[PDB]
Design a protein around this motif. Structure first.
Motif: not given
Lengths: 98, 49, 50
Positions: B2-8, B10-15, B25-27, C36-43
């Motif tokens: 469904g709804s996108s990871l970056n597209t949904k 929050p925190f204003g991040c470009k996913i 992000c807004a973080v 500043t891309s997030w990309e955590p310690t993912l498995n």
């Protein structure tokens, strides 16, 4: 000249003496003026005064004492000034005297 | 799917994909320590009057 | 000769610092931030299909 108006530009730490002074000598004929200043609390930079006629003849002056008062003998008079000799950044260096 | 990871997001991040971008992000703020050079400030009598 | 700060860490902000010491002139500076891309310690788990 008269009107010994000292424009102490920087009150340094400090190191080798260097620091700001500028006697605004209200003079009609600049030239060779008496420079070496009548106060041992801060070491003077230069020895003679290139006198700018009616001019702020610049000068170096170095005192390390944080409550500085620079009382010079700017040849036709004394000259009063006081600036805080604000302490420098580093720790160990070539030399200083004031 | 469904709804996108970056597209949904929050925190204003470009996913975004594989180099898994969650950026701008807004973080958070930016802490910094700036060892300034000697050449960055002008002189003491070096300034204009 | 070493200042420190912390600015708004969103991209789209001009940081600036007008720091000068005694005898060094007034050291204005303007820093900016980009992505500043997030990309955590993912498995990875399962590789699902039909």
């Amino acid at each position: 000249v008269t009107d010994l108006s000292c424009q102490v530009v920087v009150c340094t730490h400090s190191s080798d003496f260097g620091g700001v002074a500028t006697l605004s000598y209200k003079t009609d004929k600049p030239g060779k003026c008496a420079v070496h200043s009548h106060s041992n609390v801060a070491t003077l930079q230069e020895a003679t005064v290139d006198v700018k006629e009616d001019g702020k003849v610049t000068v170096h002056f170095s005192t390390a004492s944080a409550s500085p008062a620079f009382k010079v003998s700017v040849c036709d008079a004394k000259t009063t000034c006081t600036a805080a000799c604000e302490p420098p950044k580093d720790h160990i260096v070539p030399y200083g005297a004031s | 799917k469904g709804s996108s990871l970056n597209t949904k997001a929050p925190f204003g991040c470009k996913i975004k994909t594989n180099p898994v971008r969650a950026m701008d992000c807004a973080v958070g703020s930016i802490p910094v320590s700036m060892d300034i050079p000697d050449s960055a400030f002008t002189r003491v009598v070096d300034a204009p009057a | 000769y070493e200042h420190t700060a912390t600015i708004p860490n969103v991209v789209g902000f001009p940081y600036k610092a007008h720091i000068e010491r005694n005898g060094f002139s007034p050291m204005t500076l303007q820093l900016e931030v980009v992505e500043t891309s997030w990309e955590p310690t993912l498995n990875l788990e399962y590789i699902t299909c039909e």
